[PDB]
Amino acid sequence: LTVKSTKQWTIGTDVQGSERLNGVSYQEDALITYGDYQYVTFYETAPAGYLNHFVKVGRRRVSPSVGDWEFLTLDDYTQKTMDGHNMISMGISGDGKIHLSFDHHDVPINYRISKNGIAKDVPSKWTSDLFDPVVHELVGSQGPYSPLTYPRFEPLGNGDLLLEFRIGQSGSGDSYIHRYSASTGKWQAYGMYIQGDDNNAYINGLDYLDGKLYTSWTVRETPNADTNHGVYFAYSNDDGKTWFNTNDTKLTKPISTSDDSTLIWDIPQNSRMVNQEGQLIDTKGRFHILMRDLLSGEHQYQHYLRKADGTWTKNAINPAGLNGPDLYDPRGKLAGDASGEYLFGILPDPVKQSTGIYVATASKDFKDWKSLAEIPNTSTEPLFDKTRLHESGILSVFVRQAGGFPDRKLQVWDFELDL
């Protein structure tokens, strides 16, 4: 496997402040291909300047030829909170509507939707008036909508879309799922699906494939990030309503963080393992988790693999040149190609201030990690486009540069793979 071509685009100037608002690990998602177009969302500085931002949404054509990015500015909602939690997630439903949820740290939901199915019936003109106002509920569904952190979208197989988030706080919180029907345009509540017990679960993402929804998490006791413990897993065969552990044992609804039956790896507190890193269902149905810890004696990225024979394995990702991250360093992701043979570790390096793209193969039990490419000059939690990789064999990555405002840009890097 080799890179046929490498291209980059600067899509905006990052915002100024002591927190990272763009390129955050739990954006789900920031960069999405739907039909023939790719979409991206990020904050840019509003005319009021420092500590005033607007959400932007970019689009470009990617099939059958790649066209130029164009952007709209949502200049009716000013993001003002310098808190690295307050990121943006986007989702696109099978009616073509684009959904955005953003700007939360233990506050009520902030959500909006396109008026029409602009990703299906693609308008000529790309402007802000394609979006409805910001609302603080999900029409058709019910609360609680506060205190909300971590909106995550997952597109389902019938065009529907899940929206998942935590209600409560670090060290004491629960998570919920809501489902948007593409056929009716109404949301419905799936309710609480994981319940804390004077702690909170921190999921790594949502992964849906062929009618099954997968997630993994750690449990956090207190607002101190050293108090994470365990690596957990569950899946659902009904889009979030009911859940099973790794042994196909049905769980209680909601899943309790006290139920050890979802534990797949014992990781104590003070292991230097961070919440909300990376997960992946590959296209052959093997589940993968990216975490980190110091348990070997050195800080290293860790790959957890749920094998087909049922067994979990854990292997350090330690290819030559990769500096291992500590608790607070940027978080990575895992991506997969259409075949399921290739696993990509998209791993920010805290020494180099760059993002390494490493590849392992299913034939080698993913032990063969190798440096494939690098995105230089990043201070970001890199985020990729799942669909674009599956459909075209292009690994497309959204990144915040390193460096100082206003030199520090937002970019999309495309690695055309020789698949």
Ligand X SMILES: *[C@@H]1O[C@H](CO)[C@@H](O[C@@H]2O[C@H](CO)[C@@H](O[C@@H]3O[C@H](CO)[C@@H](O)[C@H](O[C@H]4O[C@H](CO)[C@@H](O)[C@H](O)[C@@H]4O)[C@@H]3O)[C@H](O)[C@H]2NC(C)=O)[C@H](O)[C@H]1NC(C)=O
Ligand Y SMILES: C[C@@H]1O[C@@H](O)[C@H](O)[C@H](O)[C@H]1O
Burial of residue 124 (number of CB atoms within 10 Å: 0-12, 13-18, 19+)? exposed
Tell me if 25 contacts ligand X by CB under 6 A.
Answer: no
Only one of the segments 56-64, 83-91, 158-166, 259-267 lies at the binding site for ligand X (rule: CB under 6 A); that segment is: 259-267
CB of 226 to Na ion, least distance (A): 13
Distances in whole angstroms, Cα of residue 299 to Cα of each of 293, 294, 302: 6, 4, 9
- Return the one option of ligand Y, Na ion, ligand X, none that residue 275 interacts with (CB less than 5 to 8 A, by type): ligand Y
Name the residue among 85, 90, 78 with its Cα closest to residue 20: 85
The CB density around residue 31, as the number of other CB atoms within 10 Å, is 24
DSSP codes of every residue in 114-146: BSS-TTTS--S---GGGBPPPBSS-TTS-----
Is residue 378 within 8 Å of 407, Cβ to Cβ?
A: no
Separation CA 403–CA 349 (nearest Å)? 15
Task: By CB under 6 A, name the one of 264, 317, 347, 394 that touches ligand X.
Answer: 264
CB of 260 to ligand X, least distance (A): 8
CB of 170 to ligand Y, least distance (A): 6
- Return the one option of ligand Y, Na ion, ligand X, none that residue 132 interacts with (CB less than 5 to 8 A, by type): none
- Return the one option of ligand X, Na ion, ligand Y, none that residue 225 interacts with (CB less than 5 to 8 A, by type): ligand Y
Pick 84 or 350: Cβ nearer ligand Y: 84
- Return the one option of ligand X, ligand Y, Na ion, none that residue 276 interacts with (CB less than 5 to 8 A, by type): ligand Y
Task: By CB under 5 A, name the one of 132, 198, 260, 407 that touches Na ion.
Answer: 198
Strand partners, 180: 161, 187
Amino acid at 33: T
Tell me if 263 contacts ligand X by CB under 6 A.
Answer: yes
Separation CA 171–CA 220 (nearest Å)? 6
Residues 162-191 that bind ligand X (CB under 6 A): none
Nearest position to ligand Y, beta carbon: 225
CB of 244 to ligand X, least distance (A): 11
Separation CA 254–CA 52 (nearest Å)? 39
**Could you tell me how many residues of this chain bind Na ion (CB under 5 A)?**
4
Tell me if 344 contacts ligand X by CB under 6 A.
Answer: no
Name the residue among 249, 211, 104, 221 with its Cα closest to residue 164: 104
CB of 2 to ligand X, least distance (A): 34
For ligand Y, the binding residues (CB under 6 A) are 84, 170, 225, 274-276
Task: By CB under 5 A, name the one of 35, 171, 393, 403 that touches Na ion.
Answer: 171
Task: By CB under 6 A, name the one of 70, 266, 365, 407 that touches ligand X.
Answer: 266
Pick 23 or 230: Cβ nearer ligand X: 230
Reading the block at residue 360, the tokens are: 């392992």
Pick 109 or 274: Cβ nearer ligand Y: 274
Task: By CB under 6 A, name the one of 265, 301, 342, 358 that touches ligand X.
Answer: 265
CB of 85 to ligand Y, least distance (A): 6
Pick 267 or 394: Cβ nearer ligand X: 267
In the 8-state DSSP scheme, what is residue 14?
Answer: P
Separation CA 349–CA 167 (nearest Å)? 32
Pick 81 or 172: Cβ nearer Na ion: 172
Task: By CB under 6 A, name the one of 247, 309, 363, 418 that touches ligand X.
Answer: 247
Separation CA 257–CA 255 (nearest Å)? 7
DSSP codes of every residue in 144-193: ---SEEEEEEEE-TTS-EEEEEEEEETTEEEEEEEEE-TTT--EEEEEEE
- Return the one option of Na ion, ligand Y, ligand X, none that residue 263 interacts with (CB less than 5 to 8 A, by type): ligand X
CB of 359 to ligand X, least distance (A): 25
Distance of CA 288 to the CA centre of its chain: 14
Tell me if 197 contacts Na ion by CB under 5 A.
Answer: no
Strand partners, 162: 154, 179
Q: In what order do the strands lie in the sheet with 394-400?
A: 3-13, 409-417, 394-400, 383-384
Which residues of this protein are in contact with Na ion, per CB under 5 A? 171-172, 198-199
Which residues of this protein are in contact with ligand X, per CB under 6 A? 246-247, 263-266, 311-312
